[PDB]
Design a protein around this ligand. Sequence first.
Ligand code: FES
Ligand SMILES: [Mg+2]
Lengths: 86, 135, 100, 26, 114, 225
Amino acid sequence: GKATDRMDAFRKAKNRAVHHLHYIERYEDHTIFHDISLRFKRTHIKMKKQPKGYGLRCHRAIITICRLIGIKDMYAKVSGSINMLS
Amino acid sequence: AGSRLETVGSIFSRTRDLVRAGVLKEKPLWFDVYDAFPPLREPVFQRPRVRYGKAKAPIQDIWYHEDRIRAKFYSVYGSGQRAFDLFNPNFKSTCQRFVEKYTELQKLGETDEEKLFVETGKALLAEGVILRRVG
Amino acid sequence: NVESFASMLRHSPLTQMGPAKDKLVIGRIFHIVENDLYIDFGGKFHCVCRRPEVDGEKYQKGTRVRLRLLDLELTSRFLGATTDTTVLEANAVLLGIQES
Amino acid sequence: SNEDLPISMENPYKEPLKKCILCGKH
Amino acid sequence: TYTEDFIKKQIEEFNIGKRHLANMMGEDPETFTQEDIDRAIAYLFPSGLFEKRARPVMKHPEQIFPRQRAIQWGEDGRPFHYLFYTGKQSYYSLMHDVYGMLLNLEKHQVIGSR
Amino acid sequence: EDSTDFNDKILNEPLKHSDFFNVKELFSVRSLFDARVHLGHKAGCRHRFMEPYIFGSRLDHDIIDLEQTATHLQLALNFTAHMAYRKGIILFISRNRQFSYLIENMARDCGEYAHTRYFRGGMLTNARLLFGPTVRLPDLIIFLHTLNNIFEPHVAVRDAAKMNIPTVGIVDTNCNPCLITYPVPGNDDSPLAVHLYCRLFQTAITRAKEKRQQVEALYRLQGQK
Ligand code: FES
Ligand SMILES: [Mg+2]
């Protein structure tokens, strides 16, 4: 969301994200199905599957996204460029 | 709500998942019809690429055995005064008539093109066809 | 004993015609804008020939004429293009009027 | 099977390559 | 926005107020035209403002409120016009009618005006 | 208590038959060949994602395999009819100026809609602002010409997939069917083929509309007694 006032940028981004929703598949509704390793532009993300009780040990942003998705337990390591948008 | 991610998945996958998650309270009208009679290919967006190196398209040319005959007829004689009628599906051109006779004489047993080609022209001349050679 | 598509394509007039270069066909005028005459000759696209000066009156909608095709679709690829540029019409010469 | 299928053949209508006025001359 | 029900209530206030204004001036409510209304409103509410669109006015609601398009879809939700989703169903329905009359002519075959 | 029976007998019933409206009798492989539905563009204009539907190239002129068009056209006509039977909004789109009049008339005859003019940005994604907040968008879009006048995909193909609207399209050898739900490989240039498509979609829709009035009359008549 972009605007001159900060309160107006929060609305645009918030109301526009519900129209671009994903659906994330979860293994037993607590973690991912398998280990993932990709590269978006220059940013490397290597996520790993973990059992129940492991918790979230990942970048603070990923911790905040995972709670929104519903992933309780997963490990992730970010390398390359730490850009919040990539 | 909804999902405007045209590149991610398809309208069916994106709608099937949101309905099952609870976001969409009512499934759209077309949904029940698509699940019953789905298309042959799932409409997923895929970016087109260029072919490099020795890669080539699998498309092949459509040739027939009678194309060798037509190429020679047009070279020896060429398209006659008679004009084609492409509208008429069951239309036979002067060249096509020459092919039918040329092939019919091949069934007899002649194994050479020169003699078989020459004999075919004579038959048409006997039938009244006009065959003016380029010369 | 239903005819297949491979048999229709083999015995079709267009298929057996071969290269359209210097082929005499018969077209039908279906639209006329000023002198321009839009003609259909059983192909994918039409051809736009200009009204002859000698006898133009006879060229009205429905009139059947004689053509000498040059190309079935005007295409060409130019510097920098990834695909051919098509004009969506054929190239032909208006010889005269067909009389039975 | 069917006999109306096309065949793997080279272009019959292909025209000979053009030559310069001096082709074959010294 | 002004609905059809609102306009219908404005038509009833003008008709009643048109009979009051004739009772004030001593005229016949029946033969009381709009020219007499403008003359009575300028005597009772005299305004010398140079802009005539800023003076007191008592006209018919069909001449005051701007014309508005009717509703284009019903309860079910289907529009009433086949060229609705163009956004200019009236302009294109006219261009479609004119271009249809130019095709018929081909088949079977100013001083004051501006 | 009555909606379940009303819904099942009317909506679910046609979904149990392979061909409820009998649309396979409306056309044939020979009916398409006589309309020049097999004639495609040249090889240099060929699109990569249309190769599977190309039978071959005769003298640098791609030939569309009509055997696949029939199977693809059967699914589009069936899907089109089931949406008209369900009282869905159908919209026709084509930017070919040669056939703009023909298409606009067909939509009017079959009680459907058409958009053959310049497509203003936001007709679908920003509709509530252009028309109104209670507007109802189409439930099915039919592309008679998937390209615009600059030989590029129509913007509605992408905008329809954003709004989750299924699309039916007539894709030629120089088009992109990746985002078209039910594509029909066939010629989209000659007038003898466009008149056929319009005649087929106009008939499949008119049948379904009349088919529901018979199913409802029977249910209403049977319900009372
Ligand atoms: S072409 Fe110039 S020498 Fe053969
Ligand atoms: Mg095309």
